[PDB]
Write a protein that binds this ligand. Structure first.
Ligand code: A1BU6
Ligand code: A1BU6
Ligand code: CL
Lengths: 276, 266
């Protein structure tokens, strides 16, 4: 069941850099709060938002970010989630203290475990990227869906005329070429395997791909016609097997890519023998 | 789909099996004898059902041999054997490894319950261990697979149980197992992990012990002469409650136990 929380239960809410904000619950401590809508009171979709909140609460796994509660009040709808101290994956990869190969290896296997969990329950992420991989103080990771790609009613609630905190309209580096300039195409398990491929590269590069691209359409068309992250831009020691894995996972044809159980079967013994 | 394998694909009853292209496996050969032709369709459909369970903490069925007079399940190799065999070795298992063994057991049982499977026979013999001390839950007695289990116990075929069983099933074979039946087994598996031996060694009859267990008696916590933490003793007492409804679920165990493992034991 979903825990129904109140705004009075939280003392202060400091907006943090990437509205997502750090929130101190008065009895249960530090949490993250995605406040999705703030505005005038319209109680139209509350049944579907709560049922969608129930569905996202059913997804329980050690490598998936738990929804802890929801604030469903007059003119404010928030999601409340667990706190992951080191922030997102790209924030950790850019830090002054460098992350060793064993921790990187463990990060990749935890990513695989979490994606396997979600695919096992029929969920396609549709938006796997470093920003959606959150890291605790022991370097263990949890996958989030901060763009609300799996949850239509909460995502549509953001894009509304009444909303003061409206999204006026990063993702495209990790979006599979079949989806670039193709809004109608249905994402699959294979779409996420592409994103993962680009996440692997990023883990060994310590940065976002495609730094030298100038315009958006230049990049879109480049990626659709075969261009990938530059493998020679990996300065530090990435093993041969992980480079082979990312090239396999960023195949142009979806059916040429492996699935996440197939990745895990290959990767886990490699992690244990070579990296741990 | 299930991979249909051949005897010619292997070089050799439970035995070590070398697949000619894929290396070492275990082959549980359930039947060897004359040709039983009728229920090969049900055996293959039951083989398909056991093939749907893919998880790092569950033994994968790699294939099945369904041939003239010979029926075998082929599964992954686990070098150190069952959990009880590893707990009895001359080199002791440290507390951190034991903690990780418990978490892997929890992960696997949560996987299985997530796919609607009740194990119904969780015990150290069904927990296999690899050379790095990582574990996988097995169903070596085919408790979830009636046609394959009945195929073993057949007239033509030429080829300790009670200690982990919840009291609701002792002297009540008709009662339906639940997720909570496995939670009791796990509770007794925890005890065993810190004792390095089977429970109830000093009991002298089956019927005495069964009725004792049904009326609340449990494995002896004073028999633990290693450091078992306080909160794991609290966890096993919670998990071996007489009333099934009083027991936690495996997601409930994990929520408590994982952060305990991470902060205190890792
Ligand atoms: C609460 C939110 C949506 C969240 O991370 N999740 C909800 C559930 C588990 C987790 C999640 C991760 C990835 C895909 C689906 C999904 O669904 C958060 F991002 F606000
Ligand atoms: C092949 C056998 C039966 C096996 O362990 N399993 C089959 C599938 C996954 C795994 C398993 C474990 C536990 C319960 C059911 C189950 O069903 C092996 F013991 F021979
Ligand atoms: Cl957890």
């Amino acid at each position: 069941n979903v825990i129904k929380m109140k705004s009075s239960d939280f003392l202060e809410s400091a907006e943090l850099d990437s509205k997502v904000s750090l929130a101190f619950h008065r009895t249960q401590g530090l949490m993250i709060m995605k406040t999705v809508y703030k505005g005038p009171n319209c109680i139209e979709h509350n049944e579907a938002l709560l049922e969608e909140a129930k569905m996202m609460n059913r997804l329980r796994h050690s490598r998936v970010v738990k929804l802890l509660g929801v604030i469903i009040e007059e003119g404010k709808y928030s999601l409340v989630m667990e706190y992951m101290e080191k922030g997102n994956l790209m924030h950790v990869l850019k830090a002054e203290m460098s992350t060793p190969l064993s921790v990187k290896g463990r990060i990749i296997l935890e990513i695989i475990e979490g994606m396997a969990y979600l695919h096992g329950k029929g969920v396609i992420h549709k938006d796997l990227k470093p920003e959606n991989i959150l890291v605790d103080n022991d370097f263990h990771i949890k996958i989030a869906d901060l763009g609300l790609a799996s949850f239509k009613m909460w995502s549509k609630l953001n894009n509304e005329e009444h909303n003061e905190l409206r999204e006026v309209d990063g993702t495209l580096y990790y979006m599979a070429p079949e989806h670039l300039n193709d809004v109608n195409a249905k994402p699959t398990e294979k779409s996420d395997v592409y994103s993962f491929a680009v996440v692997l590269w990023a883990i060994f590069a310590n940065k976002e791909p495609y730094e030298n691209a100038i315009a958006e359409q230049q990049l879109i068309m480049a990626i659709k016609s075969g261009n990938r992250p530059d493998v020679d831009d990996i300065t530090e020691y990435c093993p041969r097997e992980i480079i082979s894995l990312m090239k396999l996972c960023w195949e142009a044809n979806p059916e040429a890519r492996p699935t996440f159980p197939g990745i895990e079967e290959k990767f886990r013994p490699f992690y244990l023998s070579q990296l741990e």
